[PDB]
Ligand binder design. Structure first.
Ligand code: GMP
Length: 316
């Protein structure tokens, strides 16, 4: 009765206020705007990856959407078994499948911009270290730290980045504990790239500011500014590294619907396409800081500056 987009997620959370929420929102906008339909299924564990993708393929859906490094092996295999079913993979890369489109993000480029913001706010307080909490380091995840570090160093090479890995995108309790550890060490800015776990980092930041500690957090995926309001007016969210996974999902769903699915291609959503970067409006960033950020942004887009894909501590 309808063209249907089916999302298989490795997370039991489309309300994660970040990544899975953006993807579902994009699929949902596509369906609403095109008189189509959509649904999703959660595949918490590995053993459910193959059967989950297979069931949607057996329903002859218009498009099957899968995200992350946990689902890619299952997509690689399943796409070969169902050559006539279209699949979209987000945050991972598939080769040799003309029925699969891979959407990847230049998140190192966007993270460079928030690194500049972090370094400037840290210097403002005489701090020589900033924090970074990442959900997991598999797949393309290392791009965030690589760009964040590069942006921090572009402002001041002596500022150190202190990294904590949660090893989960669905544990806010862990997010708060890791944020507490960083703030307790004297850091005043933390960039969180941790999906649902990240909501706990934002909570810890709100709790600290509420009681007079001058701390900040930089959000991810969505413009998380309102998520950090702690006293009725002010927010602890310095800025956010926005990643338009919603636009990628919406646009490719439309191409599938229209017969122009770019099967077999990897599509890069970057700073020049405005698919990553910072929000258009940033109450906590001054005009001076914004001009500095915009300046670096232009040098990255033109390639005058190329942002690394791996941080210094991860390079030989
Ligand atoms: N595989 C996977 N990646 C996620 C999830 N949540 C967040 N991420 C990744 O972590 C980044 C920051 O939230 C997102 O842009 C994604 O790259 C999740 O539930 N599963």
């Amino acid at each position: 009765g309808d063209f249907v987009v089916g999302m298989v997620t490795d997370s039991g959370d489309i309300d994660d206020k970040s990544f899975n929420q953006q993807v579902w929102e994009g699929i949902s906008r596509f369906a609403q705007e095109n008189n189509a339909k959509c649904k999703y299924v959660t595949a918490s564990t590995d053993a459910e990856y193959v059967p989950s993708l297979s069931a949607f393929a057996d329903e002859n859906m218009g498009l099957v959407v899968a995200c992350g490094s946990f689902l890619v092996e299952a997509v690689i295999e399943t796409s070969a078994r169902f050559p006539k079913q279209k699949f979209l993979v987000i945050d991972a890369v598939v080769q040799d499948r003309d029925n699969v489109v891979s959407a990847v993000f230049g998140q190192n480029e966007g993270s460079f911009l928030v690194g500049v913001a972090a370094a400037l706010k840290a210097k403002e307080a005489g701090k020589s270290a900033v924090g970074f909490i990442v959900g997991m380091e598999l797949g393309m995840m290392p791009l965030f730290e690589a760009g964040f570090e590069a942006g921090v160093k572009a402002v001041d090479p002596d500022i150190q980045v202190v990294v904590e890995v949660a090893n989960t995108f669905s544990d806010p309790q862990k997010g708060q504990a890791l944020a507490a550890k960083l703030y307790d060490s004297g850091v005043n800015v933390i960039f969180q790239v941790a999906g649902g776990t990240g909501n706990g980092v934002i909570k810890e930041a709100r709790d600290r500011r509420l009681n007079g500690q001058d701390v900040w957090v930089i959000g991810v995926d969505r413009d998380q500014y309102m998520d950090g309001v702690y006293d009725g007016s002010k927010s602890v969210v310095l800025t956010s590294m926005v990643k338009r996974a919603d636009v990628a999902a919406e646009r490719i769903s439309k191409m599938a619907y229209d017969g122009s699915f770019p099967g077999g291609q990897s599509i890069m959503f970057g700073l020049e396409d405005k698919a990553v970067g910072i929000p258009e409006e940033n109450p906590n960033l001054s005009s001076a800081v914004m001009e500095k950020i915009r300046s670096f942004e232009e040098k990255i887009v033109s390639k005058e500056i190329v942002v690394p894909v791996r941080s210094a501590r991860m390079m030989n």
